[PDB]
Symmetry: C3
C-alpha cells in the first residue's frame, strides 16, 4: 500500500485492510477521551455501580471511545480522505470492558468515480465496511462509512468503477443477542435518583448548553486516527475536526440533558452539514423521537442537530451536524 | 430541576442536589490532571514510596484531583454561575486511594438576593455545603462555597431570601481522626533526600517560577465541571478559567519550591482577585506563615498570592488569586 | 540548591542531583503521552500481543515515554536552560513495564564557560550524565546531554571551568545483555501482517505525512519537565518546545512509515537545527541507513530529518531537527 495512503484509483471492490494495530482499552484512554469530549454516562464513570449493574469483568468502556478507536483504526485506508459523507449502522453487538483489545478490519464494499467537474480535483467515493472484534473473536461493531478520496495525479478519469453506493449499510443484521441482557436495571433504579424510563417523554425537543471544541488533534492521536486533514492544515486549507469529536460533544450534551442514560445502542450520521474547526463552540437541539418500553426500562430514539455559535449577536449560528442514535435507559 | 441549571430564584434554603454521578478515581484521571496542572507530590507520583509510607490499598489520589472532582460534581447546582466568591473549609477527613469512588451532595445553606443596581443583572448569592463521601460511606470532604447566580428573566426583585451568609463555613468540625496517622514519616525521611520538616522555616517568603494556563476546558470536562462560563464564551464574553485550575498551578509552584510536602491537609480561597483566562502565564509569592512540629514531622501553614504576567516589561503584573492551605511535611 | 535552579556558576564537576521524585509508569501516563505525540508501536498498544511476545509482568511502556520521564526528571538541574545542544547515548539496558518506577540521577560530567561575546549574556555549557534505574536497582538508561546555562548576574567571567566537552558520551558501554533477548519474534511474525524484517530495505529514503505540535506544555508537565523555557514565554521571548516532543512526533512519523517496528533500542540527536513552537506543523524525511539481520529479525539504523511547514506555497519549509535511532524489527 502506497506511502501516505491509497488514492481512490488504488482501491478495489473487496480489498481488505487488516494490518491496523490492535488497541487495548484502558482507563488511561478513557480519561483522555473524557477530558476532550466529556463523559457523564454513569456506568462509564462509577466502577462500583458498573459492577453492580453489569457484573462486568472490568469497568464500562465509554461507547464513544470504542467507536472512535474503531474508526481511527480504519483510517489506514483513508489517510487521503477529503470528506466522509456519513457513518452508518454502528450498532454494538457487545459492550467491551476496560482491558479488552479491539481489532478492526476495513473492507471496500463499493467504489464510484465522481463525475468530472471543471475546477475540481478528480475524486471517487469508497463505501467501506468496518468490522471490529475483540481477542475472543466476538463481534463488537460492524458498521459503514462513505469516504471521498482524491484520484492519483495521472489517473485517467472514467465511469467504471461505478458501483451503486446509495444503499450501503441497510438491512444490516441486528445483533444475535441483546448486548445488555445481563445488565440489572433494578439496582440502577434503586441507586440512581429518578426520573427513570418513561415512554411519555417521546416528542420532547430539548436545547443543550454549549461546549468548546478543543484538543481535536489529541483525540485523533489518542484513537490512531491518521486522516491527514485532522493534522495537516494544508490538505483542506485549515485542519478539519474529526466527525466523531463533534458527535462526542453532542452525546455529552444529550447526557447533561438526560443524566440517566445507561448506554448508546446504535448510531449513525444523517448529514455532515458543515465543517467544524478547533475553537468552535457547539450546542445541540435534541429531539426525543421515540420511547419504547421493554421488560427492563426502555430505549429512546434520539436525533441531534448540532450548531456552531457565530461570533456575534448579529450573525446566525450554523448547523454543522445531524445525527441520530438510540440509548438504553433503565 | 430546570434545563441548563437553576436560576437564583429556583433555589431554597435546605434544598439538596444529590443526583451527580459517582466518580471512580483512576490513574487515568490522575495522569490527565497532572498533564494540565502538574504534579510533583512524591506520594502521588511514586507507588512504591506511597505503599511504604501509607501501606494504602492503592496509590495516593492527588489531593487537588480529589477536590476538583468534588467541586466539578457540585456544579450541577451552579451551571448558571456568574462567579464563586470563595471556596472555604476544605479539610480532608481521609485521603482516598486510586479505585475509590467519590459521591458529592450539595446543600443550599443560605440565600441572599443582591441589592438592585442600575445596569446590573438581577442576581443573588447561594451559600453551598458540599459533602463528599466514598462507597464505604466515609467522609472525605465537607466544604463550602459562595456562588453568585442570575435570577430568572421575570423574577420580582426583593430582599427576602435575605440570609446572613458572612460566616458560612466557620467553626466547622475538625476531622474525628488524623487522616495521616497511619503514614510512616520515618521511611519517608530515610528514602527521600532532606531537608525534612523544620519549624525554623516559618516566616519565609518565596517566589515561584511561572506556569502557562492551558487545557482549562479539559480540566473542567475531566472533573465533570459544567459551569457554563468555563465552556461558553458568551456567558461572560470570554471563557473564565475554573478557580481550581489556578489553585492547582499555585500548588504545583509551591511543590517545586518545597519538594518534600507529603500532602495538602486543608485549604480555602481568600480572594478571587481577578479573572484568569486560557493562555495566561502565572507565578506566585509563597508565604510560609506557620510551621508547627508534631510527633511525626510537622504542618506548614502557607499563603499563596498568584499573579498573571502582563504582556510587556512596561506593564505591571496583576494579582489574580489569594489562597491559603496547610500541608503535612515529614 | 538555588530557588529557580542553579546558574552555570553554581555547578561543579562531579556534582549530583538525586532528589528528583520517582515516577511510576501507568497506563494513564501512557495514554496522555499518546494523545500528545501519537503511538503506533504495536507492543505498546496491544496488551495481548505484548504478553505473547514479551511475557512481560505488565504491558510495554512506550520507549519515548520512558525517555521523556528520565529527561523531565533531570530538569531539576536545568530549570534555567537556554538550549540543550544535544541528547546522546540513550540506549535501553532494559524495557520497563507499566507499574515499574523510574528514578534518575543527574551528574555534572564537565563544565566549560563560553567565551565572552558583546551583546550576549554570560553563559557556560554543562555536560550532564543521567542514570535512570528502577526500584529493583536495574539500569534502564545511562545517557548524556549538553545544556547551555546562564551565569549568575554578578559572575566574574573567566575560562576556568574549561573542561573539554567534545567527546561527552562516547565509548559508552553497551548493555550487559540484550534487553529483548526473551522477546519471541516468531509469534509476532505469525500474528502481525508482513512485511517483516528485510535487510534489503537499507538505503531507502521515505517521506512522512505531517503532524501538528500541540499540548507541548502538557507533555512537559506530564513528564516533570520544569525547564522554564517550555512554560514561561519571557525566558526566550516565546515558549520553546521541548526537544523530546519533536523527536516523539518524528518517531510517530517513522512508525506510520514502518508499522512493524518492535521498539527503539537507542537514539541521539545530531543537530537541534532550529526552534520549534506550539502550533508548528512538522514532517520528516526518514533515511534507513542500515539494516542488519540477527538470529530473530534484525535492527534498522534510522536517521530522521524533521521540517517545519512554512505558512505558504511560496516560502521554503525549514529543518528543525536531525536525529538518529535504531529500532528492532522482527
Ligand atoms: Cl477541490
Ligand atoms: Cl452584569
Ligand atoms: Cl542572549
Amino acid at each position: 500500500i502506497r506511502v501516505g495512503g491509497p488514492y481512490f484509483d488504488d482501491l478495489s471492490k473487496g480489498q481488505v485492510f487488516d494490518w491496523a494495530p490492535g488497541v487495548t482499552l484502558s482507563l488511561g484512554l478513557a480519561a483522555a477521551h473524557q477530558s476532550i469530549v466529556g463523559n457523564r454516562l454513569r456506568l462509564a464513570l462509577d466502577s462500583d455501580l458498573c459492577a453492580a449493574v453489569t457484573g462486568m469483568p472490568g469497568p464500562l468502556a465509554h461507547p464513544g471511545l470504542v467507536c472512535d478507536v474503531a474508526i481511527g483504526q480504519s483510517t489506514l485506508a483513508t489517510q487521503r480522505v477529503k470528506a466522509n459523507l456519513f457513518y452508518r449502522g454502528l450498532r454494538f453487538h457487545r459492550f467491551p470492558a476496560v482491558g479488552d483489545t479491539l481489532y478492526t478490519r476495513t473492507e471496500v464494499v463499493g467504489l464510484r468515480a465522481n463525475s468530472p467537474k471543471p475546477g475540481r480535483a478528480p475524486t471517487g467515493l469508497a463505501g467501506l465496511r468496518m468490522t471490529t472484534i475483540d481477542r475472543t473473536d466476538r463481534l463488537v461493531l460492524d458498521f459503514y462509512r462513505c469516504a471521498m478520496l482524491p484520484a492519483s495525479p495521472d489517473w485517467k478519469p472514467g465511469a467504471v468503477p461505478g458501483d451503486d453506493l446509495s444503499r450501503i449499510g441497510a438491512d444490516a443484521p441486528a445483533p444475535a443477542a441483546d448486548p445488555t441482557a445481563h445488565w440489572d436495571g433494578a439496582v440502577f433504579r434503586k441507586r440512581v435518583p429518578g426520573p427513570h424510563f418513561d415512554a411519555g417523554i417521546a416528542g420532547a425537543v430539548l436545547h443543550s448548553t454549549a461546549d468548546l471544541v478543543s484538543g481535536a488533534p489529541e483525540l485523533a492521536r489518542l484513537t490512531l486516527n491518521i486522516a491527514a486533514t485532522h493534522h495537516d492544515w494544508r490538505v483542506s486549507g485549515r485542519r478539519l475536526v474529526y466527525g466523531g469529536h463533534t458527535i462526542g460533544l453532542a452525546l455529552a450534551q444529550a447526557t447533561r440533558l438526560l443524566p440517566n442514560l445507561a448506554t448508546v445502542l446504535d448510531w449513525e450520521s444523517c448529514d455532515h452539514t458543515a465543517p467544524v474547526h478547533e475553537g468552535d463552540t457547539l450546542y445541540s437541539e435534541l429531539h426525543i423521537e421515540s420511547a419504547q418500553a421493554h421488560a427492563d426500562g426502555g430505549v429512546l430514539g434520539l436525533r441531534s442537530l448540532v450548531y456552531a455559535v457565530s461570533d456575534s449577536a448579529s450573525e446566525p449560528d450554523r448547523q454543522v451536524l445531524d445525527w441520530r442514535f438510540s440509548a438504553l435507559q433503565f
